[PDB]
Ligand binder design. Structure first.
Ligand SMILES: *[C@@H]1O[C@H](CO)[C@@H](O[C@@H]2O[C@H](CO)[C@@H](O)[C@H](O)[C@H]2NC(C)=O)[C@H](O)[C@H]1NC(C)=O
Ligand SMILES: CC(C)C[C@H](N)C(=O)O
Ligand SMILES: [Cl-]
Ligand SMILES: [Zn+2]
Ligand SMILES: [Zn+2]
Length: 301
């Protein structure tokens, strides 16, 4: 049972950090990430893409001056490893930011083309960029934030939340104190929203999540995003936040749109950068940044 701030406590600091977000870094990383034929978790393709992604995280770390920050693989029974990047803070209360790094072509999983641009390359470059900007803060890079922050890049999500299943089950066993988890899975597709004349917005998934955290998540989107929220259900174990919920951890899920307006190109060769709106991905970078900062600096957690 975990409770959160009623309202944002570091508006000025987060707003200044938001100005450091470089919209060009999304496509820079997303373009080569989507060039792997697929990132199938059972496949050597997914192994190679995981290693490539780990290198890109490491470059952000090496370039940051943050002496204590690490990135490590998390082996699974399949070739594609998950990746956990740790920003250690004063306490062991941990804030997790999630995306999944695999992709699938449901008609030909082993060999089919799956650029996975929106599902879920968009969430990977979203939280990778918020991670980079987070380390430009002196106290965060110094390990003086009240709480620990981790960024997770889950292997094997398209096989049934396989990587996050492994990770959170093991966190549960080793008594890891995960006070808040935010999953981001598809953050780029807005053409379904705008084609219907709906205002572009941040989807907020309301099932398989924690109510208090989802409430705080909306608080974060109102302070730090310049678009509204819309509440949606998806009606099943949508994404990796369901693995966190399964082990009693408070989780939330921010989405590109209302669930019925999301990308129809996922799980096929047609999930391409063409379908991705990076100005919307930038909005998810702002809420990721703000969520991570406000909770890293929440003493009452
Ligand atoms: C957070 O701080 C910002 C300033 O960085 C406040 O900015 C308001 O909106 C724009 C910037 O987006 C400014 O030009 C306005 O002057 C501000 N409006 C008002 C009425 O002051 C923003 O209001 C702050 N947010 C909260 C929740 O306090
Ligand atoms: C985020 C949701 C649209 C579901 C997710 N794309 C999946 O792996 O099934
Ligand atoms: Cl609890
Ligand atoms: Zn998917
Ligand atoms: Zn997905």
């Amino acid at each position: 049972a975990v409770t959160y701030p009623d309202s944002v406590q570091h508006n000025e600091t987060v707003q200044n950090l938001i100005k450091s977000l470089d919209k060009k870094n999304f496509e820079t990383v997303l373009q080569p990430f989507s060039e792997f034929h697929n990132r199938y978790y059972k496949s050597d393709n997914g192994k190679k893409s995981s290693e490539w992604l780990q290198g890109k995280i490491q470059e952000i770390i090496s370039a940051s001056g943050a002496k204590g920050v690490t990135v490590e693989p998390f082996k699974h029974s399949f070739p594609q490893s998950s990746l956990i990047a740790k920003i250690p803070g004063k306490s062991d209360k941990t804030i997790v930011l999630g995306a999944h790094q695999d992709s699938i072509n449901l008609d030909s999983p082993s060999e089919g083309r799956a650029p996975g641009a929106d599902d879920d390359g968009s969430g990977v470059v979203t939280i990778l960029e918020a991670f980079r900007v987070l380390l430009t803060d002196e106290k965060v890079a110094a390990g003086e934030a009240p709480n620990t922050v981790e960024f997770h890049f889950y292997a094997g999500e398209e096989g049934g939340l396989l990587g996050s299943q492994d990770i959170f089950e093991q966190y549960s066993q080793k008594s890891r104190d995960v006070k808040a988890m935010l999953q981001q899975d598809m953050t780029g597709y807005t053409k379904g929203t705008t084609d219907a004349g709906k205002p572009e917005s941040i989807g907020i998934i309301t099932d398989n999540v924690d109510e208090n955290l989802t409430k705080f998540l909306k608080v974060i989107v109102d302070a730090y995003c310049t678009i509204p929220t819309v509440d949606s259900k998806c009606g099943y174990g949508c994404s990796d936040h369901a693995s966190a919920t399964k082990y009693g951890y408070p989780a939330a899920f921010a989405f590109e749109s209302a669930f019925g307006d999301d990308s129809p190109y996922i799980h096929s060769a047609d999930d391409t950068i063409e379908t991705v709106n990076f100005d919307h991905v930038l909005q998810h970078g702002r809420l990721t940044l703000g969520f991570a900062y406000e909770l890293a600096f929440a003493d009452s957690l």
